[PDB]
Enzyme design. Structure first.
Site, PDB file in Angstrom:
ATOM      1  N   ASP A  62     -78.708  13.696 106.259  1.00 50.28           N
ATOM      2  CA  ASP A  62     -78.708  13.746 104.799  1.00 50.28           C
ATOM      3  C   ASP A  62     -77.973  12.571 104.177  1.00 50.28           C
ATOM      4  OD1 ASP A  62     -78.617  14.295 102.114  1.00 50.28           O
ATOM      5  OD2 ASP A  62     -77.961  16.381 102.320  1.00 50.28           O
ATOM      6  N   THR A  63     -78.711  11.510 103.837  1.00 56.62           N
ATOM      7  CA  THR A  63     -78.088  10.305 103.265  1.00 56.62           C
ATOM      8  C   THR A  63     -77.532  10.535 101.871  1.00 56.62           C
ATOM      9  OG1 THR A  63     -80.208   9.479 102.389  1.00 56.62           O
ATOM     10  CG2 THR A  63     -79.554   8.782 104.653  1.00 56.62           C
ATOM     11  N   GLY A  64     -77.948  11.624 101.237  1.00 60.79           N
ATOM     12  CA  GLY A  64     -77.415  11.960  99.919  1.00 60.79           C
ATOM     13  C   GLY A  64     -76.090  12.727  99.927  1.00 60.79           C
TER      14      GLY A  64
HETATM   15  C1  LIG Z   1     -80.150  19.987 102.229  1.00 60.49           C
HETATM   16  C2  LIG Z   1     -79.929  20.400 100.791  1.00 60.49           C
HETATM   17  C3  LIG Z   1     -80.781  21.643 100.535  1.00 60.49           C
HETATM   18  S1  LIG Z   1     -78.249  20.777 100.504  1.00 60.49           S
HETATM   19  C4  LIG Z   1     -77.731  19.138 100.148  1.00 60.49           C
HETATM   20  N1  LIG Z   1     -78.943  18.403  99.746  1.00 60.49           N
HETATM   21  C5  LIG Z   1     -79.004  17.136  99.308  1.00 60.49           C
HETATM   22  O1  LIG Z   1     -80.033  16.598  98.916  1.00 60.49           O
HETATM   23  C6  LIG Z   1     -77.714  16.363  99.313  1.00 60.49           C
HETATM   24  O2  LIG Z   1     -77.949  15.003  99.696  1.00 60.49           O
HETATM   25  C7  LIG Z   1     -77.051  16.431  97.943  1.00 60.49           C
HETATM   26  C8  LIG Z   1     -77.637  15.391  96.988  1.00 60.49           C
HETATM   27  C9  LIG Z   1     -76.815  15.405  95.737  1.00 60.49           C
HETATM   28  C10 LIG Z   1     -76.027  14.289  95.443  1.00 60.49           C
HETATM   29  C11 LIG Z   1     -75.244  14.284  94.292  1.00 60.49           C
HETATM   30  C12 LIG Z   1     -75.269  15.387  93.438  1.00 60.49           C
HETATM   31  C13 LIG Z   1     -76.059  16.501  93.734  1.00 60.49           C
HETATM   32  C14 LIG Z   1     -76.838  16.524  94.891  1.00 60.49           C
HETATM   33  N2  LIG Z   1     -75.648  16.088  98.188  1.00 60.49           N
HETATM   34  C15 LIG Z   1     -74.685  17.012  98.326  1.00 60.49           C
HETATM   35  O3  LIG Z   1     -74.893  18.221  98.244  1.00 60.49           O
HETATM   36  C16 LIG Z   1     -73.304  16.452  98.582  1.00 60.49           C
HETATM   37  C17 LIG Z   1     -72.265  17.491  99.045  1.00 60.49           C
HETATM   38  S2  LIG Z   1     -70.933  16.868  99.858  1.00 60.49           S
HETATM   39  C18 LIG Z   1     -69.839  16.258  98.753  1.00 60.49           C
HETATM   40  O4  LIG Z   1     -71.328  15.856 100.801  1.00 60.49           O
HETATM   41  O5  LIG Z   1     -70.296  17.905 100.600  1.00 60.49           O
HETATM   42  N3  LIG Z   1     -72.797  15.857  97.354  1.00 60.49           N
HETATM   43  C19 LIG Z   1     -72.474  14.569  97.298  1.00 60.49           C
HETATM   44  O6  LIG Z   1     -72.562  13.821  98.251  1.00 60.49           O
HETATM   45  C20 LIG Z   1     -71.942  14.006  95.994  1.00 60.49           C
HETATM   46  O7  LIG Z   1     -72.179  14.855  94.875  1.00 60.49           O
HETATM   47  C21 LIG Z   1     -71.839  14.440  93.612  1.00 60.49           C
HETATM   48  C22 LIG Z   1     -71.556  13.089  93.371  1.00 60.49           C
HETATM   49  C23 LIG Z   1     -71.217  12.653  92.085  1.00 60.49           C
HETATM   50  C24 LIG Z   1     -71.157  13.581  91.045  1.00 60.49           C
HETATM   51  C25 LIG Z   1     -71.450  14.925  91.281  1.00 60.49           C
HETATM   52  C26 LIG Z   1     -71.397  15.859  90.240  1.00 60.49           C
HETATM   53  N4  LIG Z   1     -71.675  17.153  90.465  1.00 60.49           N
HETATM   54  C27 LIG Z   1     -72.023  17.594  91.687  1.00 60.49           C
HETATM   55  C28 LIG Z   1     -72.088  16.700  92.755  1.00 60.49           C
HETATM   56  C29 LIG Z   1     -71.793  15.353  92.565  1.00 60.49           C
HETATM   57  C30 LIG Z   1     -80.172  19.194  99.870  1.00 60.49           C
HETATM   58  C31 LIG Z   1     -80.699  19.644  98.533  1.00 60.49           C
HETATM   59  O8  LIG Z   1     -79.936  19.953  97.603  1.00 60.49           O
HETATM   60  N5  LIG Z   1     -82.035  19.665  98.471  1.00 60.49           N
HETATM   61  C32 LIG Z   1     -82.736  20.133  97.289  1.00 60.49           C
HETATM   62  C33 LIG Z   1     -83.143  19.103  96.329  1.00 60.49           C
HETATM   63  C34 LIG Z   1     -82.378  18.030  95.883  1.00 60.49           C
HETATM   64  C35 LIG Z   1     -82.970  17.164  94.957  1.00 60.49           C
HETATM   65  C36 LIG Z   1     -84.286  17.404  94.536  1.00 60.49           C
HETATM   66  C37 LIG Z   1     -85.036  18.499  94.989  1.00 60.49           C
HETATM   67  C38 LIG Z   1     -84.424  19.348  95.898  1.00 60.49           C
HETATM   68  C39 LIG Z   1     -85.027  20.579  96.549  1.00 60.49           C
HETATM   69  C40 LIG Z   1     -84.079  20.732  97.738  1.00 60.49           C
HETATM   70  O9  LIG Z   1     -84.638  19.989  98.844  1.00 60.49           O
END
Ligand SMILES: CC1(C)SCN(C(=O)[C@@H](O)[C@H](Cc2ccccc2)NC(=O)[C@H](CS(C)(=O)=O)NC(=O)COc2cccc3cnccc23)[C@@H]1C(=O)N[C@H]1c2ccccc2C[C@H]1O
Lengths: 99, 99
Positions: free
Chosen positions: A25-27
């Site tokens: 997970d690069t995000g």
């Molecule tokens: C594998 C998951 C299910 S859980 C983590 N994940 C992803 O896609 C992850 O890469 C997310 C992306 C993201 C970056 C920044 C904000 C929010 C979200 N990142 C994360 O969940 C990580 C968690 S951590 C700190 O490592 O523990 N947050 C981060 O890296 C940094 O977050 C933040 C950075 C800056 C400001 C922020 C403000 N409010 C909240 C988070 C912030 C998937 C997901 O959500 N996917 C859903 C998604 C995402 C975008 C679009 C569609 C969908 C459907 C799903 O596929």
């Protein structure tokens, strides 16, 4: 390996001697794993994702194997929907994005 | 290019005639952008991750430019904390993970 993105980039990991599936997970800044038992003391951490924030337990210097590559680093434990390998360990395994 | 993961993989994108910064996110199924106007029909959708779900608007057949590469696909719009390029568009630009 080279991993395309037509499907979720899920890999097998090994942590605490057990195999789990996790998402490259690069995000994600950090690595977060579903509830499990890890050794040592933990410290509090709040992490924020797409839905808001959750509390997790931060364990440091944890040994984890990711698709056959050894890493040793911080692992967060808590109510994540999916085990995620974030940039802290992706960098340890020499992972890059390319296009 | 080859993008290392020492820091967040942020790039400039062009969408709806606007330049925005967005995160190249292999853990995201879909692409989600902060509130903006997009042309055409839309339908509501719930998207989930760490911290739960948010409601977004789904627009189909939207063109984006990502690092000079044009792509077309579905774009979701709503209260995401970060603009995220997900796998549905990363595939179109030939983005892979490599280690
Ligand atoms: C594998 C998951 C299910 S859980 C983590 N994940 C992803 O896609 C992850 O890469 C997310 C992306 C993201 C970056 C920044 C904000 C929010 C979200 N990142 C994360 O969940 C990580 C968690 S951590 C700190 O490592 O523990 N947050 C981060 O890296 C940094 O977050 C933040 C950075 C800056 C400001 C922020 C403000 N409010 C909240 C988070 C912030 C998937 C997901 O959500 N996917 C859903 C998604 C995402 C975008 C679009 C569609 C969908 C459907 C799903 O596929």
């Amino acid at each position: 390996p080279q991993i395309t993105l037509w499907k979720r980039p899920l890999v097998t990991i090994k942590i605490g001697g057990q195999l789990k599936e996790a998402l490259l997970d690069t995000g994600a800044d950090d690595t977060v794993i579903e509830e499990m038992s890890l050794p040592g003391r933990w410290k509090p951490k709040m992490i924020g994702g797409i839905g808001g924030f959750i509390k997790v337990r931060q364990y440091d210097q944890i040994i984890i194997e990711i698709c056959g590559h050894k890493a040793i680093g911080t692992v967060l434990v808590g109510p994540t929907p999916v085990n995620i390998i974030g940039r802290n360990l992706l960098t340890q395994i020499g992972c890059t994005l390319n296009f």
